[PDB]
Design a protein around this nucleic acid. Structure first.
Lengths: 114, 50
RNA sequence: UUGGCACCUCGAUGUCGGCUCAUCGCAUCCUGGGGCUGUAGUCGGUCCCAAGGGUUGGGCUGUUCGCCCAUUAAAGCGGUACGCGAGCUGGGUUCAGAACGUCGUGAGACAGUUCGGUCCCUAUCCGUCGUGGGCGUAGGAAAUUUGAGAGGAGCUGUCCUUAGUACGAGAGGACCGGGAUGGACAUACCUCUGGUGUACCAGUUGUCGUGCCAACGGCAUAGCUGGGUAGCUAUGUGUGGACGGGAUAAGUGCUGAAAGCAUCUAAGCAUGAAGCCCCCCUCAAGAUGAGAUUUCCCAACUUCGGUUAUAAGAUCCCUCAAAGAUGAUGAGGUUAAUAGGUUCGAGGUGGAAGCAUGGUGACAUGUGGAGCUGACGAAUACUAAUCGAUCGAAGACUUAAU
RNA sequence: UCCUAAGGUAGCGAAAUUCCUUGUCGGGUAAGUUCCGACCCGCACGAAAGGCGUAACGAUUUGGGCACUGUCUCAACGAGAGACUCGGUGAAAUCAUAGUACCUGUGAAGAUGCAGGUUACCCGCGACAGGACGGAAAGACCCCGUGGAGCUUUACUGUAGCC
RNA sequence: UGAGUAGCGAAAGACGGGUGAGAAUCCCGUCCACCGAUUGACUAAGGUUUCCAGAGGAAGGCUCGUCCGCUCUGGGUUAGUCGGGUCCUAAGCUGAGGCCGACAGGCGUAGGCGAUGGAUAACAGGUUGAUAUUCCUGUACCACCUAUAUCGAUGGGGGGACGCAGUAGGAUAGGCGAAGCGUGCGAUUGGAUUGCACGUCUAAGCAGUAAGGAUCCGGUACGCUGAGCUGUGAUGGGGAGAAGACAUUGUGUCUUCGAGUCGUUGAUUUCACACUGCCGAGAAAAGCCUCUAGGGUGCCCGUACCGCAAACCGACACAGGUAGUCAAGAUGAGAAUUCUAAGGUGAGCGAGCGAACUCUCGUUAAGGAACUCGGCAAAAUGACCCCGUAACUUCGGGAGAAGGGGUGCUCUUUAGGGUCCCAGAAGAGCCGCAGUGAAUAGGCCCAAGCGACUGUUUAUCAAAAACACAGGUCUCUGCUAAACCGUAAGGUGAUGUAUAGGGGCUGACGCCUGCCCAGU
RNA sequence: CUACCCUUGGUCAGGUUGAAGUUCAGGUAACACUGAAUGGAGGACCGAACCGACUUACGUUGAAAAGUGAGCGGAUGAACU
RNA sequence: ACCGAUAGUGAACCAGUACCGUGAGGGAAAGGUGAAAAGCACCCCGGAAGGGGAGUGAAAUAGAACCUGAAACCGUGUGCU
RNA sequence: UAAGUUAUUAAGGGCGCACGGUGGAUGCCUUGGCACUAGAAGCCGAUGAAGGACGUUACUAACGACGAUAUGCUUUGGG
């Protein structure tokens, strides 16, 4: 593991695939701080696959995204999201703290693609 | 187990000595003019500019 | 211990024995120090000092007791509501059922036996194990320390040599020394041997999906199985209980009288234990008796006679781990490497996708120890630790000295 | 020889019965108060509240083996829920007033509160369970009450019914 | 007070866009996840307005709430054929006269009430926010009424009319794979003989059909009824994968128009108490038939909704209980196991951190029960096909004894079977640590005690060596039987008759059952 | 609710064993004995629904005034409803 | 020389009723503005609730959670410690 | 430099007072009860009782009154 999130290993991996797909689709999403610190390390490793651009990279990236339409989320990668960071190395996202939320007092952040 | 004996309102008021909350730890945003939480965005009309 | 009384408790004090976890006494089992011996030596007996540490694993039984097997330096005896059920078990016994022997005409009882059978609790206050915050320690701070006191440890074997010597007709066989390697116990650690390793690698069964072949994904305990990095660990790897100083117990004495002699004692002077106080390891100035050393900061406004904020410094807030319930304590905050990513390695797995060739086909071979990779080492600001705000001194009075 | 109604037979026997008792002997075990086979010394077996034996059956009781194992030598790691921190909501049993220490005593004879000493700056949080004769239940045990109630009998007095 | 302490009731959610004073919690959407012999569909009890639309947010909801099974305001249940009455009667209750009885009243005949059973005329499709064999469209059926030889009972007879178990068969529903239509022909290497998805349609009315059987009346003697299924039409009708045309995302939607429906393979748990067998010998009354004596009309109750559940019984939006019908694909014995379809669902507190301790789960060096009352608990065996298999025995068994071997895929040859489907031999080869590669499904043996066996019991500490048991034995009982309830009438015994009934003991089977009648 | 009884309805995937009897053969004066097919009995065997409650862990201001998880017994009958 | 809303009927209130039980049956608790509703027109904060005014009133700590309004209990400020 | 003495701090607590909240005692009041005295009266019903179900108003949820002539009608006295 890296950090658990109250989910079991299976529910956690599914939630991270969900979050990374949503982030690359919309490009800025409002979530909880502890999950924004975990999607940070899963989306940035997908844009590296998108910057390599092989066929083995499409297939090793297809096993972490979901199959949603927009293009597909795998075609938006390898296209626009990978074309704009062609000289930037690292730091493809940025997290912004918004404050606590009603009902939980859970620090809600916004995460987006820099 | 059960309390052997009633609790005075001296013992109770002593034990609630450290039961409190603290001031939210806030600054003043130099665009909104209003108050905000440090390292968070301006909840008023504004941004972070960090 | 078996009793005797009937003083506390019947608006309720759970009964064995064992497990787990100890603490205390000495009337000492082992180890240490000695006097006497019907003590030749190696072994013994019996008394005196001594509680520092140590004091086994099984068979039978509910067993406490006891007997036996194999060891051991030794397998001590007692107290703590026969320690201990807000810690555990519940075999036994004191529930209801039902059967045997015996007693009763009987319902039923035991001088007994046999099969079975719901053991409750979110700890207030004292007590104990850890951790913080307030104030104090006559200015405010950063580090380094003394140690009054307190805790820990304290065990022992077996071989080789001095020496087959001393002793004894022989059989046998040493003290006092000197070396070596163990048992149990404690503590630190993860290079090695192993364990785990649910965000590492791969192989493979059923079924559903990405439109189809190839390639992948979900679910079936992590579907299962063969390995496995960092971290946490023992059975693994290191170390320890060494050497010594002072005063003594029992004992042994030297000079010496009371008592012309004798006599360790009355004066004086020695020697003598695993035990006592040091030496060894940890804590410790709330040690209100509040210690010490080095360093840093030290003007403006008042008549307040005092105030102010700011200085040295520290927090709020944020990125974290060598740390951790939380905090606290440590590494950092742009005058930057703290984390994430990204590039490069270590270790792990075991030779990928795609294509090409050889096969009817399952498959095999080549490029390429390839390609994937959580925690481990290095570097780079790309992203995020922005802006900013709070707390924090002007040093009282006597006396001696200069 | 004494007695009575006649005085235990076949089978079994230290037994679901045997006190003395872990009876004595053998087997299994390195070691077997349990177990199996014997003996008979039957406190206190016994022929339809049957004696003796039996293939199959049993969530029955009991002894011994092989395999497999954290049961254990002796513990170690990992996953999730609670516990722990933060936001919402929020009880209970209990309670004479409490600023609620330890030792040696003392006392209705086992003291947090008394005597004499020793120790202890004020306020919290996680955790343990020795004590408050901890909490629940006006002791089921024992005894008592000219208490109750169920059952028995050749206890007393009656009755349904039958002759 | 305990104390902001215990708890917040089994479980997967994530983001986007709205609305709003306020959103983890409400609405819409995409991805993911769960059940699928059930969390899906339909109904009997039972609740009794909880169902729908428009508004609301004081209290209820274990948090929130802009939401609701909650508050307010308006609505929603349609029958000649469905279930009940105007038809029948079990068990039982009631009972004119009647019998018995201090009273009250108990029992009982004719008669009556009474289902869980018997009889009894309707089916497809469409429609709304809320009904649906009920309304509407189409096509039917039954009873009675009016127009343009028959009736035969309150009576006789037949039928109605029945148990349990076993296979063999006919047909069908449903299931699947090709062809025939209607849309698609692309992601990332590849292909285009490629990927999906649909196939019909009722009752009634006509044909023919496996199979199977001497009161005119009944009884005595001396080609007939019925019968699943198929088929022509009903049906130029209806429906539908979808296709082309119209205005405000015409989101969407009204609207007319027009399309395929074919043959085959296995096969019900549905369709006959039919046929065969057996002992335990398997309702009654009416409808119905039978013989004699003689162009209209069509009523009352229920109907909404939940119904394995947040709406019923449990005080609760409570892990429990609750009768019946339906029953998909891969795999298979299968209504088992794992994954899914139709359809539903994400469970009314979360976010962190990843301490001790408790609970549930996985692994473990060397040994192996040493633990302990006690191998408790867990692990081990487990599927199918082959060999093989002991003492004992009541000759059935023990026995799945015990103990061993095999199991994947590919390709070759190769007698089967059903009518595309099912079952095999052998040989050659490939791979890995592993071949019922997951889920699931016996540990076994050697001796003793008890009870013969299956069965039953202290609803909530006992499930057994206890109760029952088939069999044994004794005994009362000659029929208004004894015995039992009432202690009367009236009943059970029993519509039975000693090979029968009540009571006591013992408890399959085998060998046996000693002596004593003092005494009660 | 619970215990017996009465009446009248309902449910019990599957798979496996193979009693009586019958029938062919053979053997006898015969009965009647051995073999092979056929048949499909049973408080029969394995095992889901269904009905139970043997062992253990959990819980014990329980989810609940008797439950849950994992295993366990019967499952054509003296069944269950 | 009876009670005066814990009293007096169980019931001064729309009580033998909420309810609770299968049933027979059991059984509460709830009084008071003012002399007259004259029961707060209007302005302001708020989504509403609720206030603060200004008016009615002799009185609004008389505003329908309505006479008086106490004790336990819960708070805010402060004098000495 | 040295020796000695002494004080402010109050995180929070104790006491005294001032002002609020809660809750509904007490005081005073009574729509209604209790116990009795003197005088009527001491039965209703098959001509259908006591007791109830369902309805009735312009609305009507409920209580009183009433009954398809229904929130009531005629007639003879009071007012």
């Amino acid at each position: 593991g890296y950090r658990k999130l109250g989910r079991t290993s299976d529910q956690r991996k599914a939630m991270l695939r969900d979050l990374a797909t949503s982030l690359i689709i919309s490009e800025r999403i409002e979530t909880t701080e502890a999950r924004a610190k975990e999607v940070r390390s899963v989306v940035e490793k997908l844009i590296t696959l998108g910057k390599k651009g092989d066929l083995a990279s499409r297939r090793n990236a297809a096993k972490t995204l979901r199959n949603v339409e927009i293009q597909t989320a795998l075609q938006k990668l390898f296209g626009e999201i990978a074309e704009r960071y062609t000289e930037r190395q690292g730091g493809y996202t940025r997290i912004l703290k918004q404050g606590p939320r009603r009902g939980d007092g859970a620090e809600s952040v916004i995460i987006e693609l820099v | 187990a059960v309390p052997k004996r009633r609790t005075s309102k001296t013992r109770k008021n002593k034990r609630r000595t450290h039961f409190k909350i603290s001031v939210p730890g806030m600054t003043e945003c130099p665009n909104c003019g209003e108050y905000k939480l440090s390292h968070r965005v301006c909840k008023n009309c504004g941004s972070y500019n960090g």
